[model samples]
Target: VQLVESGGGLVQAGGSLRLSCVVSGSAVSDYAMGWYRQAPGKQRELVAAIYNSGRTNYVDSVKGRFTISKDNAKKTVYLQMNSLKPEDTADYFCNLLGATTMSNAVWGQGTQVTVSS
Candidate 1:
């Protein structure tokens, strides 16, 4: 019933980054996996989502450089982004998405990434 999320830390602008979540106490495919971020302030957004069927969705704002995929062998989900901007500084979180909405998402502690020049 816990998600171990990692990969958020310091980085320079324009660099690429990957964040990951390892699922335990449940099947990794039992539910959808989602990536959410909260930039400074309360601006929260769902960045991307992935399903067991290999289905993937990314928000319009982050389409080209952002990707969400699962590593079957590792039982892990990863969210990666490139062309980082300082404004992208935020706290990222992983969600065990239930249903077709955000009704109930089991969240991991936020991993804050700091982007700087």
Candidate 2:
């Protein structure tokens, strides 16, 4: 399976952004999807994740601003964030999770977004 990342760029601190990950060679609902972020010079953090059962979990740090969802029919997973801050500037990635391990079974190209004044 493969994932294609799309959407993201520059935005103001109070603005919002939407990102998408299209899955190929498999059904999106067949695997869990993880959304992660990595700020410049920082380690990656998992912001949210959606299970194949349609359940979702968001990290406490991003729960207020990040929303994770999936479209089974389109085989796509989406991430939406509002109330951006300078700290929000980072590279985001969508990952397909392995059944046993939360490890990335497949990864989408990173989408970098810069939040500024």
Candidate 1 per-residue C-alpha lDDT over 78-106 given as tens digits, one digit per residue, 9 for 90 to 100: 98889878877899988766522646555
Name the TM-score of candidate 2. 0.88
Clashes of each: 0, 0
Q: How big is the positional error of residue 115 in model 1, measured in Å on the Cα after superposition?
A: 1.4
Per-residue lDDT for 66 in model 2?
84
Highest-lDDT candidate = 2
Local distance difference test, each candidate = 0.81, 0.83
lDDT of 1: 0.81
Assess every candidate by TM-score. Answer: 0.85, 0.88
Q: Which window of 10 residues has the lowest lDDT sum in candidate 1?
A: 97-106
Candidate 2 off by > 4 Å: 98-106
Candidate 2 structure lDDT: 0.83
